[model samples]
Target: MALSKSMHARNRYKDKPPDFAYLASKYPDFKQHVQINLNGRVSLNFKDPEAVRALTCTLLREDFGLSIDIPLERLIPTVPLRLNYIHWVEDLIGHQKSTLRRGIDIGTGASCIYPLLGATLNGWYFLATEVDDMCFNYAKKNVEQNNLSDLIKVVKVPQKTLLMDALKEESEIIYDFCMCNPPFGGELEFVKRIIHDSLQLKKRLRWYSCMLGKKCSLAPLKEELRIQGVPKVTYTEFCQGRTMRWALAWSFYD
Candidate 1:
């Protein structure tokens, strides 16, 4: 019942990388950044930030009908990797046969990538929370521009309290799951404690997931979850060529 390759069999970009040639034809700005070699094959300079940003924009527009603008310094998410996470979550809850009505996204960043993709692809609603002012503002704009304000809600929370202030007003609402991409290093430790302590406040969630950048962080997080007596735990490695990350999920239910 845990994650497996079959869980992601339907993702278009799973086996194949994005086709620059097709994308170039659909989005003019993306075409400007792509180059045709002497062999007549289209290629892009992935090292170029502008090209990277353009490709992300084109992918969102062409594939999902979502429009978003990411600032130069903000973290630009890899679409395939993000999609992989969403698909894995879908597999995790597929057996319920009930609609996944509400989920929470912590640290949504400037792209607000998770909620946007989740809303457009699966018709799931999200309560996305962000701490940074710049990221919070951009996340709201991205959600609004896509006309998904009804399905995706963005909230600005204090860095000191992750979900307390955001969820304090909604104590009566039950969430299907909560996903977070904490900044690496000590921030991951903070998130673990936040989730562990937050669970004590109320039975507001069924599952908790954390995406981590370091493999070393996996064992400690899993151990901490076990020590806290979490009912179920799962870990997965997300790889896109040379880049690699990990995802961990803990469930409070049977």
Candidate 2:
């Protein structure tokens, strides 16, 4: 929670991080995982997968009225950091407002987090995709469970593909933006593929964006965009706890 000062103003956890004691007392499911410290402070074992995943579930329900389930084996998303990216998207499209916008979420994990957050928070529509069978199955289940089927459509694409198969049928669909938090490692290669795909999809999507797992990745990705002569490119940092994520966006239009 050290970097909470730099958290997005809209992030609920920014000012006062979640109160574990309060949560434990309020939600029995979460209470099972919390430890009462000798100093009387309630603490959570961040390393415990069940505890970490439970916190995510509790926070979503408490903050957004969203209920979701995720497998312990899959990647667990942290609410504060994910909120930073969503807030950034809000700024990119337009701040101080909400319009019925449509966006694509590339590789939405088992929780289908971005789409769920985007839809619930902003009343936005999303076309979320995932290549992994487990992620795809659970992504749909999460959306269905949350009763967001009308707002989010989860598609399972084949390996070695990005936007091609997902968008092929919609010749008239132009997205407001596209978001991705790709698999970790091989950061440059993964993002470079998105950059390449963005070139061909030019203007079909207003903004092509992705979050980087490492800071060193920005230079090469930015350089790739520079070489492509993309008209607009922007990047920002998501400061939260010990993990810091860098997000980059580019647009072919002014």
Candidate No. with top TM-score:
2
Prediction-by-prediction clash tally: 0, 0
At residue 118, candidate 2 shows an lDDT of 94
Candidate 2 is scored at a TM of 0.95
- Judged by whole-model lDDT over C-alpha atoms, candidate 1 comes out at 0.80
The alpha-carbon deviation from the true structure for residue 90 of candidate 1, after best TM-score superposition, in angstroms, is 1.2
TM-score of 1: 0.91
| Least accurate 10 contiguous residues by lDDT in model 1 | 1-10
**Predicted structure 2: lDDT:** 0.88
- Which tens-of-lDDT digit does each residue in 80-198 have in candidate 2? 89898898888788846655788999999999999999999888899999999999999999999999999999999888888766896555467889999998647799889899899
**RMSD in order of candidates:** 2.4, 2.3
Q: Candidate 2: misplaced stretches above 4 Å? A: 1-4, 95-98
